[PDB]
Amino acid sequence: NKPIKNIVIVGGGTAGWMAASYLVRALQQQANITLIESAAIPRIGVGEATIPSLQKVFFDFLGIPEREWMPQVNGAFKAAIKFVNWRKSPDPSRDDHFYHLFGNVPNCDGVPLTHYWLRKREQGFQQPMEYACYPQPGALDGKLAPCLSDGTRQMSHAWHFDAHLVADFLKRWAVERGVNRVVDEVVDVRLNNRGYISNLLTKEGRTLEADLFIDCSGMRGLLINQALKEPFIDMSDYLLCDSAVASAVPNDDARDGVEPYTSSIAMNSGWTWKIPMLGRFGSGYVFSSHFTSRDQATADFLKLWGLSDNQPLNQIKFRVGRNKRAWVNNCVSIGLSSCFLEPLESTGIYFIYAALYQLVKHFPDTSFDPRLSDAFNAEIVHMFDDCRDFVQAHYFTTSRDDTPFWLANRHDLRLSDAIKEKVQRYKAGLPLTTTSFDDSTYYETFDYEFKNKWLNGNYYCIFAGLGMLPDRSLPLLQHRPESIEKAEAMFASIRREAERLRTSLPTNYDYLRSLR
Amino acid sequence: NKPIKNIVIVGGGTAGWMAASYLVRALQQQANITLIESAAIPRIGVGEATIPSLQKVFFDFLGIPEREWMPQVNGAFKAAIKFVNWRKSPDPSRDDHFYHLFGNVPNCDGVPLTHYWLRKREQGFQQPMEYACYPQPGALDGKLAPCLSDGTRQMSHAWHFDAHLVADFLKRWAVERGVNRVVDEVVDVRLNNRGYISNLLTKEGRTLEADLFIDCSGMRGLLINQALKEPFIDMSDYLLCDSAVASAVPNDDARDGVEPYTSSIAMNSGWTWKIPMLGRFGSGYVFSSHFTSRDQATADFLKLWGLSDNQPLNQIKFRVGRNKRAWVNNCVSIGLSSCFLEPLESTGIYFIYAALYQLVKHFPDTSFDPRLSDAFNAEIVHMFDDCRDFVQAHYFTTSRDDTPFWLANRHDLRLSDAIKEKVQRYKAGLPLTTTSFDDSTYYETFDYEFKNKWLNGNYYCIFAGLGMLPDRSLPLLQHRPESIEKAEAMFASIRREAERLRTSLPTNYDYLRSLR
Ligand SMILES: Cc1cc2nc3c(=O)[nH]c(=O)nc-3n(C[C@H](O)[C@H](O)[C@H](O)COP(=O)(O)OP(=O)(O)OC[C@H]3O[C@@H](n4cnc5c(N)ncnc54)[C@H](O)[C@@H]3O)c2cc1C
Ligand SMILES: Cc1cc2nc3c(=O)[nH]c(=O)nc-3n(C[C@H](O)[C@H](O)[C@H](O)COP(=O)(O)OP(=O)(O)OC[C@H]3O[C@@H](n4cnc5c(N)ncnc54)[C@H](O)[C@@H]3O)c2cc1C
Ligand SMILES: [Cl-]
Ligand SMILES: [Cl-]
């Protein structure tokens, strides 16, 4: 079969230029890549939070080190997500916060530290799980950097940045390496009688043709949804939020510092993200239109940060779910054109480079073997649905009942058999999927991580944080006092590391300043 | 809940004493373990072949190094399985053999060497896959040891031994560490109205009681099948063989050497195993009674090795399949009481210590939370069904059509959706599950291996060996000539290692002799 030689990418957002960059890197020879993007249709970039695999899977593949791209996007460091007022109904006299931290939890004789902690709590141990099982939460409370002053890594971390800038960065990178950039707007898509994309008709009268089309046109799904009629699976029965009111809020970093984490502040009919950068933090009230009006949500958002009625706002709406098939005929959907999930766990950009990773792993020729796209589509389904369930697990697990929104999350959600099964195992006291701690190649081979994205530690951070604990500790531990004693030594070690971090880490602000 | 304190194991075979050994090791405190075995009911031990996880998962857990247990069981080294006359109808003028080797296949720019080999074959490359992608097949042809004379490991390996002796070894090991051994025969099992095992009535009038019962009574399933009425899922529609005629055959190792591998010699209505040890090799014609009589199979077996009509034979029969649930109420089935699969891929003893591993991971208290057994049962189902599909893939893939037996395997088998999906992906040219080569922690964390037992390399050895190749090479490779060039360097390196092994390895016989 003849190889794919001409590729057309529709879209100049984060998805489009990640696709252009990744493909021009992966396809070293025999690859003509063209990207068309409309100047009259804006890109989505609200100030985004990410996860560590952005470096390992995407930028490492491009050969771009962290020190190269991060200052070009005015990046800040992210070491966790802090959930505020998610556990109980808001009480100004109560400190309601917990962290979902990056990194793996140590194992002790084949059992994660989370389970040794639970047994301790049964006997009266008061300290919260993540403060016992991780070394960095207290450091995050102190708004400290994830690295020493000399740049030595001290904890797993990701990044906060304006996605507009990473698109510009990748634009310059990809164009320099041969990607043809076209500023124009597609107005019509022509299919043959078979149903394959023949050509694209633009606004300036250009006719674009290719062997392979990549749809990065955003939520509208110009190619995959509108032209190819691939149905979008609405999953509003799984998750309730469908809107957002967002803006940027100035921050006096000199006296307030820069929080080295994303915040998720539970509201009456949703939650508000806080994504710190230098000089400001991006913020957005994600809400359900069925429980609050955009007007009311706007008022709550302004009141939360004490913003004025003159503050410019980014009014957003979206549909939760995914296409039935991400790849149909000769068109691959990447980004918002493929799927969407509320930014509760920073999975948006992850969906992009994870899908691109899978596209190269299933790269077609001009014959377009349906076995390739079928396999690709199955991977996308697994990827999205797994993250959807993890996010949903934040909702039906909550104890809040103060508003109709939270009551609905507790009782009226549709749950997959998969997430029901995990929760059942968790409640039984069983550890979920764990990996080796004294190895960490889980982060080095993406096939492993892609198929097992969320581990025991991730779920425990969420569940224990929301106050939903297993019925009992592992029955096995009653037979292994030596293992229990060994776990105590590990807890003590974590406590010592936390104390060392407190006096060794520079503030996140000072470290970000040293990088200018 | 009160902890499990009294445990009764029924059975003194390989399963029973592995269970006794593993549990007395895992349950350091609060564990009274009793094993009852009948002296009038023999154990099954035909001379068994194993896989490397026996050391990593079982003996390492007991703290017993290879050098300790192997000479106690008169063990020989196994480095692969050689399949003879499986590809085509037997032709004495043709050499029909291929190896299924232990170990992982190297990756080159995210693609296994198997796929770079396939592309080469498309362009005329003649050398068989496993001889190109592995360094040791030629060494195995030369009957060389898997280690240097000084004991330095040179290739991944497992073991051949009489399972009777490993049972005796573990018996002595477990009894010395507190396991109570009872020589008697259970004649009646009493259940309460709930359906839980109350007590065991023996032949000498003893009444045995416990919190937890382990059924290692063999194929009869004294507790799980007969008492608890748990249905056995007959899978004769998946696999056709149901019988075996076996014996031991003397070998002049001084002039013939000792083959460092198990052989699988395809017959008219089944296949014959060859499991070499010092001084002899165990052998057994596995056959389907629906295509040949035991009498005819016996004659073929004797004729194959030139044995006489006076040669004592072990006439065996079995049912292929598994219990619907491995663990019911307060009874856990381990070994032949749980499931059986023909020894095509040496999975029998694997099923034992893998299940025991899972039992400890799901260890109950006296309340017996059904969530624990449900989770355990699901793992057993995955374990068996996955190995069943892998074994079955040897059968429906063959090109042989010379007998009704092989025609039936080609056309009349029932295939799971899972195996159909894998074959489809393979035929499309896609790599199956792969792991990191420059790491090998896949063999260090059993959770990983248990869920992903058979990798791309394993399937490729079987499929390419049977002459069933993908329709085409990976389309991506047409865009990456640099990766192709890089793979050539790896092939050259493997060729050099093979040449070094040829002149460096002692013969398997001489090395086994040096260990006496
Ligand atoms: C409210 C919100 C919060 C988010 N938070 C996070 C987060 O915290 N972390 C994270 O990682 N991700 C997050 N995401 C996701 C992420 O921001 C976006 O998915 C990503 O940055 C851009 O996706 P996209 O490029 O596919 O869509 P878009 O940004 O909409 O890109 C659309 C592009 O296609 C072009 N185009 C469209 N139509 C046509 C046409 N007819 N002809 C020609 N050209 C055309 C447009 O000009 C534009 O260039 C969030 C998304 C939203 C909506
Ligand atoms: C033909 C064949 C080939 C095989 N090849 C391989 C191979 O190559 N590699 C591999 O790893 N595995 C292989 N296996 C599997 C392996 O040999 C056996 O599964 C294992 O060695 C023994 O299994 P078991 O102990 O559960 O059953 P058994 O050996 O039958 O043990 C039964 C025990 O339960 C006791 N018992 C029974 N009944 C009663 C009662 N009413 N009261 C009291 N006590 C009782 C018996 O006395 C006996 O001790 C093979 C099996 C077969 C049949
Ligand atoms: Cl997101
Ligand atoms: Cl076996």
Author numbering:
A (entry chain A), B (entry chain A): 2 to 517
The authors write:
Flavin-dependent halogenases are potentially valuable biocatalysts for the regioselective halogenation of aromatic compounds. Flavin-dependent halogenases require an associated reductase to reduce FAD to FADH2, which is then oxidised by the halogenase and O2 to give C4a-hydroperoxyflavin (FAD-OOH). It is then suggested that chloride attacks the distal oxygen atom of FAD-OOH to generate hypochlorous acid (HOCl),22–24 which H-bonds with an active site lysine residue positioning the electrophile in a spatially defined orientation relative to the aromatic substrate. With PrnA, the carboxylic acid and the amino group of the Trp substrate are engaged in a series of hydrogen bonds to tyrosine (Y443 and Y444), glutamate (E450) and phenylalanine (F454) residues; the indole moiety is stacked between aromatic amino acids (H101, F103 and W455), with an hydrogen bond between the indole NH and a backbone carbonyl group (E346).
In light of this, we sought to engineer PrnA to improve its activity and regioselectivity with anthranilic acid through structure-guided mutagenesis. Consequently, a series of PrnA mutants were produced with selected active site residues mutated to lysine or arginine. On the other hand, mutation of F454 to lysine and arginine shifted the regioselectivity towards para, with increasing 5-chloroanthranilate (4a) produced (38% and 46% respectively), while also increasing relative activity by 4-fold in the case of F454K compared to the wild-type PrnA. Following further mutagenesis PrnA double mutant (E450K/F454K) was found to display a 16-fold increase in activity compared to the wild-type, producing predominantly the para chlorinated product (4a, 54%). In order to rationalise the effects of the selected mutations on the activity of PrnA, X-ray crystal structures for F454K and E450K were determined at 2.4 and 2.3 Å respectively. Electron density for all active site residues is present and it is evident that K454 is orientated towards the substrate binding site and the catalytic residues K79 and E346. Attempts to obtain a structure of F454K with anthranilic acid bound were unsuccessful most likely due to low binding affinity of the substrate.
